[PDB]
Amino acid sequence: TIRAVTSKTEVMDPAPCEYVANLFSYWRATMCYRITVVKTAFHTGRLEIFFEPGSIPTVRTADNLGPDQTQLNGTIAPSDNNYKYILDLTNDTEVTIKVPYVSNKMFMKTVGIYGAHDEDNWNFDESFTGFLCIRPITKLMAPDT
């Protein structure tokens, strides 16, 4: 994000897995994402988690960077021809996805979003093998109770 007085300095919110790579140049590693839903035994719904390799349909803001939601509908980039996991929410909630590392280039830079904005989004597109994208299979099923 951007902290202002204008000045508009940037600020981050990193994790160790991210706190290290900012200390180096290139990287190679498998990742592990713990997905935990907070709910009762009533909130039910099939949730789909799918991977897409490479760049993203994003919005190149003048100072910051973020995604694009239009290019992800169930028609544009569906999840049939994409690695998939359909988590049920009846009683099995905790998940820990393990993503190995695959990409045309051996390693990857570690600037990520640093100095990223409208124009200089390049290393960002090269500093991420791809992206996961959650998309509900079903509307959250839970009574007004």
Partner: protein, 197 residues
């Protein structure tokens, strides 16, 4: 590596049905069927196998091929709230769209219908199910450049309409999800003529 894209599921339709309604998503298998003006109201007729191929981007694979023999699979996922209770029946009748009506799954009773091969489905116990609809054709193998002689109709039908609170204030609805893939696969003959559809 050559076929297994076929043996990789695909989402057809995400459905929703709500309490209180009186539409095609209800009227579970009228005990009698006197007239073809008031037949058994279905949910989503899938004229397999075509509807499978034309989705999931599998057609681009089936291009430059002519003949096919495949038994299709199914996986129904269902996520409703405990406060709902209902039952449905899925069923498949071959050539149901190319045969006199006196025999069709439509224009036919509830007893006969549920006698058609398929399976029941509850919203609390059998949350998710599957099925194997075999190679129902009557010829050497199915063609692809034609894509007109779909040799099956996958009829969905309900048993008990949705049931929820007396207030039934818009939260007493459910949601479905269908997935399909193929097994016992056989790609045999090449060609240049491609089904553009």
């Amino acid at each position: 590596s050559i076929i297994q894209f076929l043996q990789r599921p695909v989402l057809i339709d995400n459905i929703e049905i709500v309490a209180g309604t009186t539409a095609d998503n209800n009227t579970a298998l009228s005990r009698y069927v006197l007239d073809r003006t008031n037949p058994q109201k279905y949910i989503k007729q899938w004229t397999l196998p075509s509807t499978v191929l034309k989705a999931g981007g599998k057609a681009q694979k089936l291009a430059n091929f002519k003949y096919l023999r495949c038994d299709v699979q199914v996986k129904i996922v269902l996520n409703a709230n405990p406060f709902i209770a209902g039952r449905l029946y899925l069923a498949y009748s071959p050539y149901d769209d190319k045969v006199a009506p006196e025999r069709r799954i439509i224009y036919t009773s509830r007893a006969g219908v549920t006698g058609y091969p398929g399976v029941e489905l509850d919203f609390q116990l059998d949350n998710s199910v599957e099925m194997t609809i075999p190679y129902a054709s009557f010829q050497e193998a199915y063609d692809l450049v034609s894509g007109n002689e779909d040799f099956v109709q996958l009829y969905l039908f309900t048993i008990a309409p949705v049931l929820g609170p007396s207030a039934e204030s818009a939260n007493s609805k459910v949601d479905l999800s269908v997935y399909m893939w193929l097994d016992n696969i056989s790609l045999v003959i090449p060609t240049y003529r491609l089904n553009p559809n």
